[PDB]
Amino acid sequence: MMQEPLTKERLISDWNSNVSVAVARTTAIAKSSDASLVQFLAADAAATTKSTANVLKQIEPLITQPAEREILDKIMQVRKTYIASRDKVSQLKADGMAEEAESTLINSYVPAAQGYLKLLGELLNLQRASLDAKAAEVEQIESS
Amino acid sequence: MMQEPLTKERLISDWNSNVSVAVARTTAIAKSSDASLVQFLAADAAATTKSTANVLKQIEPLITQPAEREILDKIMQVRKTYIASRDKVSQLKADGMAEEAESTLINSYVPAAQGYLKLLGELLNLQRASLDAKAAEVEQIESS
Amino acid sequence: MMQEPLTKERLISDWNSNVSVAVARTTAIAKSSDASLVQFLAADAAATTKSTANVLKQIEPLITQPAEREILDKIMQVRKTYIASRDKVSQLKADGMAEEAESTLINSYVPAAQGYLKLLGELLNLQRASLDAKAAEVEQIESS
């Protein structure tokens, strides 16, 4: 049928929403004074990264047109920065350096995540225009 | 094969279980004294609502018989009440009014969630009877 | 195609990662001094157990060769021990006996979970060797 544009929109939408939960999770890792919860949240981030990477493996072959591939390569670049700083706040907090963890959260993590979110937004909007275009086509074929 | 009654039972069962986690999550949002965790939990509820709404989009077209459609429309009505009060405790807590957040949790949220859970239970039990009926049929066809 | 060895590796990998998040979750249940969060975490474990059991239902029929079935029966045995002690720390903590909850965490839970993780590791590595073997075969057929 026409389930690939649908799947792309669904996956990218979930990706956009998960990043926004992760931003608050990272904030709790930096600011929370409950050590065993910080450990649990860091473990959960360690698993979410795997589920995300699997997702990226899934959508990679589905994004072929120029603008979407430009945005996706841009997200792949910024995501390394994002992970690097997120893991730095996590490692800093686990090592008893909370003031520097919070500092890295404000000076590096939030800007990198903000760029990440902007690129996910642009990707989502582009994919919506693409989805409506594909729909108008599939209807122009099922009709005639 | 006969995977639609199976999928309906699986999805409704997960829905019933997720609501029960959400009830404890909302309780933590009202009662916890860890602000950054409250922020993380509220963000997580914001994403779970999306995943749930997608689910409802999925099962909607699968529920066609009378009793199940009556129960499902009843759940759709009570779910607005549920979300409204859950978001109210969340907004009250984020705005520094914790006593009123806890009060809304006891006076509005728990009753609305209780109704929600009862309707999910009735839906699940009905779907189990339906699943065994469909199974007896599919076996009556694969046999003969 | 050849998506069953792929699915087995994906599911077992996720299983291995989820157990590692659960170990930190159980630790937070024993050590955290935030009662409403402990309640939320226990509810979340109650749902994760269901999602896991569904998974085991899924892979059961997919594991047929001798070594993998030996490892899987071993995991099924150790998982009862694991759940029993995890639920014991959870029930002990909910009942106001935190010192004994932490004690059960060190003396029973961590050893049982460690055995669990070792068996998941052996299963994963075996499934990777199996996946590459199946790949070499499928290529030996698509070629010729």
DSSP C100-134: HHHHHIIIIIHHHHHHHHHHHHHHHHHHHHHHHHH
Q: Is B2 helix (H, G, I), strand (E, B) or coil?
A: coil
CB C133 within 8 A of CB C125: no
**Distance, CA of B142 to CA of B119 (rounded, Å):** 34
Method used to obtain the model: X-ray
Q: How far is C39 from chain B (nearest CA, A)?
A: 6
Interface test with C, best of B6, B7, B25 (most C CBs within 10 A): B25
Query: What does the DSSP 8-state code read for residue A108?
Result: I
Q: Provide the shortest C-alpha distance from residue C20 to chain A (in Å).
A: 7
Task: Determine which of B29, B34, B37 to mutate to test the interface with A (most A C-beta atoms within 10 Å).
Answer: B37
Which of C25, C34, C38, C40 to mutate to probe the B interface, most B CBs <10 Å?
Answer: C40
The alpha carbon of B66 is separated from its chain's Cα centroid by a whole number of angstroms, namely 20
At B94, list the tokens.
Answer: 């984020």
Residue C71, exposed/middle/buried by CB under 10 A (0-12, 13-18, 19+)? buried
Nearest-angstrom CA–CA distance, A104 and A81: 12
Test B25 with C36 for CB contact under 8 angstroms.
Answer: no
Structural contact between residues A85 and A112, judged by C-beta atoms closer than 8 angstroms: yes
| CA-based nearest residue to A125, from A1, A3, A7, A13 | A13
- Tokens encoding A115: 């760029």
In whole angstroms, what separates CA A50 from the centre of its chain?
Answer: 12
Tell me how close the Cα of B32 comes to any Cα of chain A, in angstroms. Answer: 12
Which residues of B make CB contacts under 8 Å with C? 10, 13-14, 17-18, 20-21, 23-25, 27-28, 30-34, 37, 41
For residue B95, what is the DSSP state? T
- Residue B47 with chain A: CB contacts under 8 Å: 17-18, 20-21
Distance in angstroms (rounded) separating the CA atoms of residues C124 and C72? 11
Of A13, A18, A34, nearest to B34 by CB-CB distance is A34
* CB-CB neighbours of C61 under 10 Å: 7
C-alpha A31/C-alpha B48 separation (Å) is 24
Task: Find the CB nearest C32 among A36, A47, A50.
Answer: A36
Distance from the Cα of A75 to chain C's closest Cα (Å) equals 24
Cα separation of C43 and C38, whole Å?
A: 9
Provide the token pair at C51: 């999602």
> Do A101 and A92 touch, CB atoms closer than 8 A?
yes
CA atoms within 13 Å, Cβ hemisphere of B144: 6
- Alpha-carbon distance B70 to B85, whole Å? 24
- Cα separations in angstroms, C76 against A65, A123, B78, C57, C116: 47, 44, 40, 12, 9
Token readout for B125 is 């039990």
Helix (H, G, I), strand (E, B) or coil at B65: coil
The answer to whether C117 touches C16, Cβ cutoff 8 Å, is yes
- Chain A CB contacts of C13 below 8 Å: 50
How many angstroms separate the CA atoms of C123 and C67, rounded? 9
Which residue has tokens 């099924």?
A: C76
Q: What is the DSSP letter of B32?
A: -
Nearest CA in chain B to A31: B36
What resolution, expressed in A, was reported for this entry?
2.5
Q: Of B17, B18, B26, which to mutate for an interface test with C (greatest number of C Cβ within 10 Å)?
A: B17
Q: Which residue of B has its CA nearest to C34?
A: B32
Q: Do B24 and C40 touch (CB under 8 A)?
A: yes
Chain A residues whose beta carbon lies within 8 Å of the beta carbon of residue C37: 34, 37
The tokens for A103 are: 């500092």
Cβ burial of B127 (10 Å; 0-12, 13-18, 19+) is buried
Dist CA A121 CA A20 (whole Å): 12
- H helices of chain B, in order, are 3-31, 35-59, 66-94, 98-104, 110-142
CB contacts, 8 Å: B41 with chain C: 40
How many CA atoms lie less than 13 Å away from C123 in the CB half-sphere?
30
8 A C-beta contact, residue C78 and residue C119:
yes
* Residue A2 phi, psi dihedral angles, 5° rounding: -135, 55
Q: Which residue of B has its CA nearest to C36?
A: B28
Which amino acid is located at C55 in the chain?
Answer: V
